[PDB]
Amino acid sequence: TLKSRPENLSFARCLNTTEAKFWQTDFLKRHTFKLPLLITDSQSCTLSTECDTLRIDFGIKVLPVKESMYSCSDYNYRTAIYQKIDEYIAEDGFLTLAKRYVNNIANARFLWRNRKGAEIIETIVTIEDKEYPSFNSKSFNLDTFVEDNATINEIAQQIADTFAGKREYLNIYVTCFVKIGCAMEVYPSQEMTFDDDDKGKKLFKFEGSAGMHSQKINNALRTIDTWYPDYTTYEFPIPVENYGAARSIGIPFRPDTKSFYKLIDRMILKNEDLPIEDKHYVMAILIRGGMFSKK
């Protein structure tokens, strides 16, 4: 029997994302070479004349949920969280969330603006040694989740096993191929500049070349949350924040007892059973990680 959350409770993320990098190349000879693409000057970034493809390389590290809590100043709360997580493993097995994350990877949501107006999009997923067949991201929409692909099932199974208790680590390397066209414009990440003298646009330079932040790709992958109130009114997945917040509507979708804090109170403090949707949401929040401390 518990009364309140501890004065110092926090979690570490179970999905680490490496920063992106841009490598312009040609589609017809993509497995031959790759040329660097640099920021040219209000800065900008455009493909060279003799080039018609853009390639993005990044990686994801997956860690178990149980061994991913940083600080918790209550042994009783720690044991309660442990048994709740074990119950979720016994019931679900972290398979739905793994399928959703793999689906988010497969539809190439992380391209952001560069996804729009692309002739051909291809995504190849590389496990520790082996590789998986190429993904045609043009056939996957941003609204419905496919739970029938064999490769999606395999990668989701591996991710779920690394999540619950089976494996201690996983590393996934993702390469992309987008055929924008010859001498087009790409949109890397933008610096949040602090100097007040000039307010020109500043792009992201990673090892000389361009690329996106890890936070942008993490936010793109995190958008799987559909189990929120008034879903039929809106009908689009949103990212997983505490108070269901977003930026395309500017509305706190969970300003009430559907928020993560009330859910964790009704889950741990009162031991009240919850629907599988709330369990899915609270596991997604735990996977994302953050700081949850009492006042």
Binding site: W112, R113, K116, G117, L142, D143, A220, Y234, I238, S248
Partner: protein, 175 residues
């Protein structure tokens, strides 16, 4: 006044203005010139507090119904279907608000060249002032970027609501 409603799907990251001015306005202009000047465009989301807020919803209006049927927006827009939503429920409405194009003013160089070509009175120091004041209004209105295929340049077409209900709108669908 038959109407057809298009929605920009929210949650895709891209701002609706880019989608409007990238693959909605040019194709709409193409079929507007192709179907000989019988359509108009309205934005049922305009709020005005400090700037243009064109918003999410767009609507195309026509006097006839068979004109909208022959427009066939379903197949022409069947490439960005994951970003826009088109409904095949053309009905009759009687609460529309029309929009008229307001005209900007050219910069120093073009106006100076036009003045030298014409009866140049060469009031160089305060001439720009006369245009800049006007621009200080036309720079706080809703606008759409467009790449002119015939001439080869790009501009910033502004628009604002009006109280008129009828008339020949434009080839652009605006008034």
């Amino acid at each position: 006044m038959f109407s057809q409603i298009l929605i920009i799907k929210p949650g895709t990251g891209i701002s609706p203005n880019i989608i409007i001015s990238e693959d909605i306005f040019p194709v709409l202009h193409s079929l507007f010139v192709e179907h000989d000047k019988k359509f108009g465009i309205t934005f049922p989301a305009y709020s005005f507090d400090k700037k243009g807020h064109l918003g999410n919803i767009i609507e195309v209006l026509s006097e006839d119904k068979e004109a909208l049927a022959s427009l066939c927006l379903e197949e022409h827009l069947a490439e960005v279907t994951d970003y826009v939503k088109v409904k095949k429920e053309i009905t009759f409405t009687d609460d529309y608000v029309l929009f008229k194009r307001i005209r900007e003013e050219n910069q120093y160089e073009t106006t100076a060249r036009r003045m030298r070509k014409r009866g140049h009175t060469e009031l160089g120091r305060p001439l720009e002032m006369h245009i800049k004041k006007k621009n200080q209004q036309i720079f706080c209105h809703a606008y759409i970027k467009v790449k002119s295929a015939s001439t080869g340049q790009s501009y910033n077409i502004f628009l604002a609501p009006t109280d008129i209900k009828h008339g020949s709108f434009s080839a652009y669908g605006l008034l």
